[PDB]
Symmetry: C2
Subunit: 224 residues, 2 copies
Amino acid sequence: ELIKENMHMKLYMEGTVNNHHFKCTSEGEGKPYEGTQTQRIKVVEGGPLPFAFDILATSFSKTFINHTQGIPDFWKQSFPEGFTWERVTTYEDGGVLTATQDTSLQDGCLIYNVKIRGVNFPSNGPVMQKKTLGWEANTEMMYPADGGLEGRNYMALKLVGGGHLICSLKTTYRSKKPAKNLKMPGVYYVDRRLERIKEADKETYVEQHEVAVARYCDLPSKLG
Amino acid sequence: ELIKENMHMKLYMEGTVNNHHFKCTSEGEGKPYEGTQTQRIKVVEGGPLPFAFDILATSFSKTFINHTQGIPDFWKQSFPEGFTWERVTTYEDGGVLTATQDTSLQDGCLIYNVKIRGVNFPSNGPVMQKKTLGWEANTEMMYPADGGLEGRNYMALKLVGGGHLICSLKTTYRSKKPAKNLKMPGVYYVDRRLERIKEADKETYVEQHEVAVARYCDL
Ligand SMILES: [Cl-]
Ligand SMILES: [Cl-]
Ligand SMILES: [Cl-]
């Protein structure tokens, strides 16, 4: 098929956070039907970043979600034409980051192009002081809206010395495939874990791993 | 012990939404350790309500959460003194609902006192026109913060014709008991399913059920 049991990926990312311009590239591979993937990420311009790499981490891959039970796979069905997404992440202490992404397929390779615009991260806050320690595992609630798919979620970013910085994520995913050709899912949930394999040189190189599984609610229902 | 295998609850609620005052009472029972409960609710003043009953649903019970794996129980451990919660619910179309709750324990019964204020619900929106069909199941993120425990989540309200109206919930849970007494949990999640069971007389009488389970992320 188009989405093989092993797929490779290449990513290009450009952006500004506050007033610092940067570029990253990455390459990796994963098991799209097992919901696992790895990316080796390099900061190739504007490094070392003067802000926590953590704020970029969710911007680096929806094709690699294991859809269990019923669920029609919005992202795998979108090929060969692919899909796009746009996200606004709003941090409770100030910081707002917009990310927009294009996912396409060429030569059997997934290609990601990402743009990033973050502003108002406080100068003395943990993001700009690089005092963060990764994301807590979480659950994204997915729901169909106008033939597209919407995601809503709160995430918690670990801080040096304990405690957390909280942010809200508001995401829209759009297929480039004509709506008549894809089966739309109902409401469902994606459990995911974002972790690092290795990092070096002040997060100038980061190897990042994700596990993700799409499911219905585990709880029993009195109506159905 | 002081929170038994079966527990009855009584509730008193007062509020105003878009300038429409109302009062509700309820009674119910559940199994705190199994994370299940039912309430039978009556609108005793200002009924029938001119807004969707659904916007009130989350204001009617944290003692009835099944704590699995390791997780220390902030709520059960807070008795006999009980606890408070306070919440802002912000709807993506402009409605804001603030609630303040007191949970106490008296003669073996759980007693809830709730006060609610709702403003800015669009006059021709789904809430004021009663076009809503209940809440999707959802997961609340729980973490230690402030003077107690905080909760965050988004909830999705089903609308007639197949859409959803989204709102965010921001909650602070404060114990009335000395913080040195209770064991404080790390970051965890509460899967909930809140289900309407019955309504009668234009939602003047409503029966509501909840299933709730505390867990870490299960990958
Ligand atoms: Cl008031
Ligand atoms: Cl009105
Ligand atoms: Cl959420």
